[PDB]
Scaffold this active site. Structure first.
Site, PDB file in Angstrom:
ATOM      1  N   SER A  67      -0.700  15.712 -12.147  1.00 19.85           N
ATOM      2  CA  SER A  67      -1.124  15.059 -13.462  1.00 19.85           C
ATOM      3  C   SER A  67      -0.984  16.390 -14.394  1.00 19.85           C
ATOM      4  O   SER A  67      -1.834  17.452 -13.881  1.00 19.85           O
ATOM      5  CB  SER A  67      -2.032  14.302 -13.509  1.00 19.85           C
ATOM      6  OG  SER A  67      -2.474  13.839 -14.713  1.00 19.85           O
ATOM      7  N   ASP A 117       0.840  -1.175  -0.096  1.00 16.81           N
ATOM      8  CA  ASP A 117       0.149  -0.018   0.083  1.00 16.81           C
ATOM      9  C   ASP A 117       0.888   1.549  -0.071  1.00 16.81           C
ATOM     10  O   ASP A 117       1.268   1.644   0.968  1.00 16.81           O
ATOM     11  CB  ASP A 117      -0.882   0.053   1.088  1.00 16.81           C
ATOM     12  CG  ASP A 117      -1.976   1.039   1.378  1.00 16.81           C
ATOM     13  OD1 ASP A 117      -2.000   2.044   0.229  1.00 16.81           O
ATOM     14  OD2 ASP A 117      -2.585   1.429   2.388  1.00 16.81           O
TER      15      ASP A 117
END
Ligand code: 46R
Length: 330
Positions: free
Chosen positions: A199, A35
């Site tokens: 992004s 994770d």
């Protein structure tokens, strides 16, 4: 040193991925959920409340000659999905794919929430976010990666998650045969303890690319792709009959649909998530309403590039002095 381990989807939807991990001496092998959005290595154990164990493999520290109680240490974690667990702490030898760390904090669960109990395939979590998020008290502990880093050939790990197939986590090296083209690297902020990056935009299907900054986290422990409501609405508007359902808890779409791809930007590069990756199947057995793999982050407070996005790429988690993230197509 290096390590290399195969990671395997837990079910036919790729709801999560499990990777075998050796703990203790002799080795006890547990299947952990790696994770990159948390920083605790915790396991089902011989100390876990018996009624809260249902099929998981447990770690028994009393059977490990290298286990030592970390005196006074406790831990307690709550995840973004509402699940939780807590307990005490041992140090022990932990190996992943041939890479060994001695003195790793292994957090033994005394209590786990129902969603963990109900998932027989996940024996615990191995956190790979920054150690500043580790919950051990009163002395915060380091992640497996943080402990291994100085010994690694290169201070990196890579995630290569499969679509409906196994993939690989590598530590200490970049497998140049595992991706196509070049890896594009992008800046990371560690201020919230996550692999947080920005992004450069998105496209839906064959549509034009929208240049827009989207701050979010690379999180292997989250199943879906969670993005701003504007972006998510633009995606689902291209699927006939798709709608946001408050009763179901997100966007659903007719199972008869063909889903468009979704592209996200990494600098000037582009990662394309095929439409099929965005199908999470019937909302309940036999239903013709299917659950979408791209959902709004509006309730969450952060955008999350979870498995739906990451499994479309070869992803480098670069833990150099100034961390960065790399993405390649594959
Ligand atoms: O829930 C956690 N991580 C995943 C999230 F970022 F999506 F929320 C968490 C808990 C403690 O540290 N991190």
């Amino acid at each position: 040193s290096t390590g290399s381990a195969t990671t395997t989807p837990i079910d036919s939807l790729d709801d999560a991925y499990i990777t075998p991990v050796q703990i203790g001496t002799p080795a006890q092998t547990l299947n952990l959920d790696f994770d990159t959005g948390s920083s605790d290595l915790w396991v089902f154990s011989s100390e876990t409340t018996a009624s809260e164990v249902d099929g998981q493999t447990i770690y028994t520290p009393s059977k490990s000659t290298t286990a030592k109680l970390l005196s006074g240490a406790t831990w307690s974690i709550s995840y973004g999905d509402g699940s939780s667990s807590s307990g005490d702490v041992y140090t022990d030898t932990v190996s992943v794919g041939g890479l060994t760390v001695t003195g790793q904090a292994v957090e033994s669960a005394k209590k786990v929430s129902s969603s963990f109990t109900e998932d027989s395939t996940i024996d615990g979590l191995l956190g790979l976010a920054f150690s500043t998020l580790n919950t051990v008290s009163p002395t915060q502990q380091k992640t497996f990666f943080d402990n291994a880093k100085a010994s690694l050939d290169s201070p990196v790990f890579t995630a290569d998650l499969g679509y409906h197939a196994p993939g690989t986590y590598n530590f200490g090296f970049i497998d140049t045969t595992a991706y196509t083209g070049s890896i594009t690297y992008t800046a990371v902020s560690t201020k919230q303890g996550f692999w947080e990056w920005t992004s450069t935009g998105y496209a839906v299907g064959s549509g034009t690319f929208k240049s827009t900054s989207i701050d979010g986290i690379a999180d292997t422990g989250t199943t879906l792709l969670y993005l701003p409501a504007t972006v998510v609405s633009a995606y689902w508007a291209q699927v006939s009959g798709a709608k946001s359902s408050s009763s179901v808890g997100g966007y659903v779409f007719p199972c008869s649909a063909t889903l468009p791809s979704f592209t996200f930007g990494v600098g000037s590069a582009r990662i394309v998530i095929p439409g099929d990756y965005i199908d999470f199947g019937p909302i309940s057995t036999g239903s013709s309403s299917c659950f979408g793999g791209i959902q709004s982050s509006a309730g969450i407070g952060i955008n999350i590039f979870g498995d739906v996005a990451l499994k479309a790429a070869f992803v480098v988690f670069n833990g150099a002095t100034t961390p960065t993230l790399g993405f390649a197509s594959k």
